[PDB]
UniProtKB/Swiss-Prot annotation, chains A, B, C, D, E, F, G, H, I, J:
It comes from Homo sapiens. The gene is IAPP. Belongs to the calcitonin family. The mature protein is largely unstructured in the absence of a cognate ligand, and has a strong tendency to form fibrillar aggregates. Homodimerization may be the first step of amyloid formation. The modification Tyrosine amide is found at residue 27. It comes from the Eukaryota. This is Islet amyloid polypeptide. It is found in: Secreted. IAPP is the peptide subunit of amyloid found in pancreatic islets of type 2 diabetic patients and in insulinomas. Amyloid fibrils are degraded by insulin-degrading enzyme IDE.
């Protein structure tokens, strides 16, 4: 019985320019 | 019994320019 | 018995320009 | 019985330029 | 019974330029 | 008056999400 | 008056998330 | 008046998250 | 008046997170 | 008036986090 | 005499803004 | 005489801003 | 006489700003 | 006579700023 | 006569600033 939690809650990102893998969940 | 949770809740992104894989869930 | 959850709830995106894979779920 | 928690709550990012793997969860 | 917690709460990042692995959880 | 309630009394093995926008300018 | 309540009394093995925006300018 | 309550009385083995924005300019 | 309460009375084996922004300019 | 309370009376084996921003300019 | 010239300006996306790319007098 | 020239300016994204890329007099 | 010239300026992202890339007189 | 020249300036990201990349007189 | 020249300036990120990369007179 294995449980994996990847959560994003109430996060604010002002500006994202020429970036990669920002605010993402990767399994 | 395996459970995987990838959640995005209440996230705000002001501006995203020329970016990749922003605010995404990848399994 | 395997359950996978990829959820997007209440997310706001102001502007998305020339970007790829933004706010998406990929399995 | 194994449980893994990767959480992001109430984080603010002013500006992200030409960066990689910012504010992300990787399993 | 093993539990691993990787948490980010109330963190503020003013500006992130040409950086890698900032404010991220890696398992 | 605004009253927003999320009540849980049973056994939950899945995802329960609630998103609310009251009198807001959301982009 | 604003009243936001999250009440949990049962057994939870999953994710319970709540997001609220009241009178805000969200981008 | 603003009242934000998170109440937990049962057995929790998962994630319980709450995010609130009241009268804010969020980017 | 602002009242923010987090109350816990049961047995918690997981994550309980609360994030609040009241009358703020968040970037 | 601002009242921020975190009350714990039960048995906690996990993480309990609280983040609050009241009338602030956060970047 | 007052001369105002506006040319060749590219605007990506404008949200809830005022007096953008205009000749205001 | 007053001369104002605006040319070849690229703007990515503008949010809740005032007097951006404008000839204000 | 007053001469104001604006050319070849690249702006990435502008949020809650005033008088950006403008010829203000 | 007053001459103001602005050219070839790259701005990455601007947040809650005033009089950025402008010819203010 | 007054001459102000601005060229080839790279700005990474600007937050809550005033009179940045500008020709103020």
């Amino acid at each position: 019985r294995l449980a994996n939690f990847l959560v994003h809650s109430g996060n604010n990102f002002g500006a994202i320019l020429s970036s990669t893998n920002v605010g993402s969940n990767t399994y």
